[PDB]
Amino acid sequence: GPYLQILEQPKQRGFRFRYVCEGPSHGGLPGASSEKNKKSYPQVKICNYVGPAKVIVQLVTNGKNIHLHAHSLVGKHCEDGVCTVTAGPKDMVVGFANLGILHVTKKKVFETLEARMTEACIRGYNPGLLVHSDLAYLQAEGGGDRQLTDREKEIIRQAAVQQTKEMDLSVVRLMFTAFLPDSTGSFTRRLEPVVSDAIYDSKAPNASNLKIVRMDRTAGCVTGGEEIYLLCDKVQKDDIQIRFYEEEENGGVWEGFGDFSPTDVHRQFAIVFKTPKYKDVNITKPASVFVQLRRKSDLETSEPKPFLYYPE
Amino acid sequence: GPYLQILEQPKQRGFRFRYVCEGPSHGGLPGASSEKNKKSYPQVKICNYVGPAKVIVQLVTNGKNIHLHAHSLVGKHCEDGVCTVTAGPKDMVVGFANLGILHVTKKKVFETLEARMTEACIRGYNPGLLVHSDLAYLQAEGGGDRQLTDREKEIIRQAAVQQTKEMDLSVVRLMFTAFLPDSTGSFTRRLEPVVSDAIYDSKAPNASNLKIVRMDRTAGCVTGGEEIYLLCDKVQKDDIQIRFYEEEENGGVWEGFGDFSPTDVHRQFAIVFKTPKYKDVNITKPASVFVQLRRKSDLETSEPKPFLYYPE
DNA sequence: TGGGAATTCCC
DNA sequence: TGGGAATTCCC
């Protein structure tokens, strides 16, 4: 049966949600495989054609049951947190370049959410899926839906009250929904919507871009127990660790860990630790390895810093 | 003639304003001489007598034109950010040993201020002074109040906007005003206002308590210029210096400053610098000194740390 | 408490 | 497609 598929997925880490105050984002949500040598943006295609359609993107949460998020996708074909673009006659590939994510404050959550659920329900933007398991019975587009009843508005309120409590403002997903032409003109054949993978705010303490900016000693004697002051960018004391390693590739490469306690991490921007023992014992010659910060929650890592062990 | 006279001034530095979210300050705004277990708090006296008296404590603006501040003094005998005390029948010297300072949010500064001007007009608590000359008349012959009129609300809402733009949310000053009696229970024979000293918020980035936490190298060569990694509590890169000094007799003997630029202060919690040389090199025997941080602005400092220069 | 960190804003 | 700090809030 005809369908919607994501070609270019959105990249999970590295992009920052912006608050209204910050100004626009410089670029937009990037694609999973982007890099400076050659950048990229999220992309989807409607398989099995099924007539020139329209595609809507929306921000949903990262939970057991995907509901509406209170942050908003901002961009050219975007309005009220919902983006809407058309699938031209011949080309069924839709790309999403310059997509910003707008970050709401905890104050304006319930507020924004209630409106999103209101507009979703009247505009047929998947009310049973995202809003409440029992509502706005049916989808479609601009022909077969309109003004709400008290019971509904009421259901919409209890939903926003609860869901405001269970929303993470650090993680977000993209939901794409396509509409094939019903009757004549009126797009309304909604193909099953598909949710992208999680996108985490790089300004979130646990999804931050890890970095070693400078360390007092960049070489140490084989053994290790030499105290080193390392200055980094914001890290979480009970989740960070210093990883010394040697990329021998063909086999089990080397790996050791700087020694310290959570109390040694000074105000999130520095760690005073003690070097670990090189290749168990050692004698060698000056053996080069790398140092890096790594999060034990998600094993995400910082750019490497070259270290150098020297015999005794 | 009768005079209001601040005996004991407030603790000008070291007190933390608390958001309504945070509760009490445990103690009470202490005075300029409050030593642990020898507690002394702000004090005033009305000289030349006046009889039973009433005294209001209201928070005002540290600025080229003292106005009503947006924050609020909270405590017993304190209501709506205005405290009132009945200068005893014979005593005449009053003290407030439990004043707390409630920090408003940059968001709620207009509403709170506007209301403060309103309740200050409808009660004669220095309107033509704190608010706008135009509302000086406010006291007239009202039975302990007023019912605001035409421009007598407009100019208020007006002033609240221009003043909210001015406001420094880190500093406050107290204004004590004594109220003398007459025919019937009046207590409306004012006395010129007395404004205490500037009270700076401890949680203010530029009034916090300076402190050296750990050091890279605690001793050096008399021919300083050696690099140290210093972990400190919050400082500001453009207003910080590190001083190496020592005990001696009369006369400016030794005082040296660490070598670095603002770019070397790392995320406000660490500084990377070069040590200064002694007033020599040509000496024998290690000479102990002290290192201390200090704000270039006001010259506030931290508890010093030992340093030892070596010969060869 | 107040020592610290999460959240928001500013160029 | 940053860099760096100031503001509130927790417990």
Side-chain angles (χ1 to χ4, degrees):
Chain A
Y3 80 159
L4 195 290
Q5 278 313 297
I6 323 167
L7 276 41
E8 176 90 273
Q9 197 66 260
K11 193 175 187 320
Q12 297 197 88
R13 283 156 194 102
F15 188 69
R16 50 190 283 173
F17 303 179
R18 287 289 184 177
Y19 286 86
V20 186
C21 65
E22 303 187 59
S25 177
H26 277 203
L29 188 55
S33 311
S34 54
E35 211 298 276
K36 302 122 177 175
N37 71 76
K38 264 156 286 72
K39 316 181 167 72
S40 51
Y41 26 110
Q43 214 179 43
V44 297
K45 173 200 52 173
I46 299 166
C47 295
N48 312 88
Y49 235 97
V50 269
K54 282 187 174 174
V55 193
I56 63 163
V57 199
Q58 307 167 268
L59 281 177
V60 301
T61 61
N62 190 236
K64 282 314 304 166
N65 16 63
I66 68 176
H67 293 134
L68 285 188
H69 205 92
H71 291 165
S72 309
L73 256 356
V74 189
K76 195 166 77 295
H77 298 130
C78 298
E79 10 63 33
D80 291 331
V82 172
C83 305
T84 315
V85 69
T86 52
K90 297 137 178 171
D91 201 21
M92 307 326 271
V93 165
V94 225
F96 299 92
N98 289 222
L99 245 203
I101 297 176
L102 190 78
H103 198 315
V104 288
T105 56
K106 296 195 143 192
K107 294 313 173 181
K108 296 181 76 284
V109 178
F110 170 93
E111 193 229 73
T112 309
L113 221 218
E114 234 197 339
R116 292 297 176 260
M117 300 178 160
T118 286
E119 258 287 37
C121 283
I122 75 179
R123 276 311 316 257
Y125 293 150
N126 316 153
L129 244 75
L130 310 185
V131 181
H132 199 298
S133 56
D134 63 357
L135 201 83
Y137 354 72
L138 253 263
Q139 335 74 25
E141 274 290 88
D145 43 78
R146 223 169 187 165
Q147 270 60 313
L148 279 23
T149 78
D150 290 350
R151 213 342 157 62
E152 303 179 325
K153 286 172 183 182
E154 264 62 325
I155 296 170
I156 292 176
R157 161 149 304 231
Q158 297 183 214
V161 158
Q162 286 299 312
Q163 304 180 15
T164 282
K165 301 169 172 43
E166 50 158 56
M167 194 188 323
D168 194 336
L169 315 200
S170 68
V171 63
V172 97
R173 279 182 180 165
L174 306 193
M175 162 131 304
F176 306 80
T177 291
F179 291 114
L180 320 170
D182 264 314
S183 193
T184 31
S186 295
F187 299 91
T188 34
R189 313 196 228 135
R190 182 201 61 163
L191 306 162
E192 253 278 315
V194 76
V195 68
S196 79
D197 25 76
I199 308 179
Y200 308 91
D201 190 5
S202 78
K203 296 291 278 77
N206 52 40
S208 175
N209 295 338
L210 258 12
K211 180 192 251 127
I212 283 175
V213 329
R214 75 197 304 177
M215 38 191 318
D216 61 9
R217 292 184 76 263
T218 43
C221 187
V222 295
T223 296
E226 246 132 45
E227 178 191 87
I228 306 191
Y229 278 42
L230 184 153
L231 304 190
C232 47
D233 273 356
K234 209 178 306 182
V235 309
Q236 301 204 282
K237 75 165 75 182
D238 273 271
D239 195 53
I240 198 66
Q241 67 187 189
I242 294 128
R243 203 199 165 221
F244 283 92
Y245 74 93
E246 192 164 34
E247 53 202 44
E248 59 182 307
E249 304 296 281
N250 290 58
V253 302
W254 194 63
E255 179 233 273
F257 291 104
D259 179 46
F260 66 94
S261 277
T263 78
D264 287 292
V265 193
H266 171 73
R267 302 304 273 95
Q268 291 184 319
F269 296 96
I271 313 181
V272 170
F273 66 106
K274 276 174 189 177
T275 50
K277 184 151 289 179
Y278 177 51
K279 292 267 233 311
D280 219 44
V281 282
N282 281 232
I283 43 279
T284 333
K285 245 46 72 188
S288 297
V289 290
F290 284 106
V291 191
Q292 87 195 163
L293 292 163
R294 163 235 254 188
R295 212 162 248 138
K296 28 168 149 174
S297 50
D298 65 349
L299 309 181
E300 281 294 310
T301 238
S302 83
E303 33 80 90
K305 248 257 186 176
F307 198 59
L308 181 78
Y309 272 92
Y310 45 60
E312 34 202 346
Chain B
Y3 283 155
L4 190 302
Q5 193 202 264
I6 306 174
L7 290 180
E8 169 100 292
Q9 281 258 6
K11 209 37 151 291
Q12 200 174 208
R13 212 171 296 251
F15 188 69
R16 170 193 176 139
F17 304 172
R18 302 178 72 67
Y19 291 79
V20 52
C21 71
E22 311 175 272
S25 81
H26 171 55
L29 178 68
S33 62
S34 194
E35 267 89 75
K36 187 69 179 183
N37 169 86
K38 182 199 276 191
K39 297 173 297 191
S40 56
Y41 309 66
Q43 285 221 327
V44 311
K45 165 187 54 192
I46 152 62
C47 291
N48 202 137
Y49 223 99
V50 296
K54 191 184 69 165
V55 190
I56 65 166
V57 216
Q58 54 191 132
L59 226 43
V60 299
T61 267
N62 171 104
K64 287 289 192 74
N65 231 258
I66 306 186
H67 280 128
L68 261 180
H69 198 97
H71 294 166
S72 316
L73 288 167
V74 299
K76 35 62 256 160
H77 324 147
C78 259
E79 184 201 70
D80 294 18
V82 180
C83 337
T84 56
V85 72
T86 61
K90 293 179 190 172
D91 292 89
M92 305 327 271
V93 187
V94 286
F96 320 90
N98 257 192
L99 291 173
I101 302 184
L102 194 291
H103 200 135
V104 296
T105 296
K106 266 133 202 301
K107 295 65 197 285
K108 299 214 183 317
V109 167
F110 173 84
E111 48 195 284
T112 58
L113 183 58
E114 184 173 31
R116 292 298 187 253
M117 300 176 130
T118 284
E119 50 204 71
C121 284
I122 304 184
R123 202 62 190 280
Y125 295 154
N126 294 272
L129 175 61
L130 272 28
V131 194
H132 190 336
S133 62
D134 297 4
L135 291 167
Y137 57 88
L138 293 186
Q139 80 281 140
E141 303 177 289
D145 75 285
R146 173 53 177 132
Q147 189 160 280
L148 314 190
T149 64
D150 209 71
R151 299 304 310 289
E152 196 175 291
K153 281 196 163 187
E154 177 56 19
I155 62 203
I156 279 177
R157 185 234 63 232
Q158 299 238 116
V161 184
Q162 219 75 289
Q163 298 183 183
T164 34
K165 299 176 178 183
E166 308 188 307
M167 210 174 301
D168 187 325
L169 261 30
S170 68
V171 205
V172 291
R173 288 203 280 194
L174 287 53
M175 185 189 262
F176 313 93
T177 292
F179 285 95
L180 304 66
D182 263 310
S183 307
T184 311
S186 124
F187 276 134
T188 50
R189 194 162 82 222
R190 209 194 70 170
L191 214 31
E192 252 210 67
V194 185
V195 176
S196 62
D197 263 307
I199 300 187
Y200 303 95
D201 191 6
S202 65
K203 266 291 194 231
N206 69 344
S208 49
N209 183 60
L210 275 0
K211 162 158 145 75
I212 293 182
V213 174
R214 275 194 191 232
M215 258 177 107
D216 208 31
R217 118 188 315 165
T218 14
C221 184
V222 175
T223 38
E226 285 174 299
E227 173 176 286
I228 305 182
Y229 268 44
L230 190 153
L231 305 196
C232 57
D233 267 354
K234 204 191 274 204
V235 310
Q236 289 169 296
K237 71 181 179 295
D238 284 357
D239 185 49
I240 200 70
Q241 61 196 343
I242 144 164
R243 220 185 155 245
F244 286 72
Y245 61 107
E246 68 169 329
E247 68 293 286
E248 209 64 72
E249 288 63 67
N250 173 59
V253 185
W254 178 241
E255 173 205 67
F257 298 91
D259 185 27
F260 74 98
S261 285
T263 342
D264 298 301
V265 182
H266 165 84
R267 297 317 200 219
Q268 300 182 306
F269 288 102
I271 308 189
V272 177
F273 66 102
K274 246 66 160 302
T275 58
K277 66 165 188 184
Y278 212 163
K279 184 58 210 294
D280 60 86
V281 33
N282 310 321
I283 64 127
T284 166
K285 181 172 312 312
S288 185
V289 311
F290 289 107
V291 182
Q292 189 175 63
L293 294 152
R294 177 172 70 184
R295 290 186 175 95
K296 297 175 165 296
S297 75
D298 53 295
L299 282 80
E300 196 178 332
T301 68
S302 45
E303 225 203 303
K305 292 265 181 167
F307 191 59
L308 197 79
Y309 283 102
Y310 278 77
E312 296 160 323

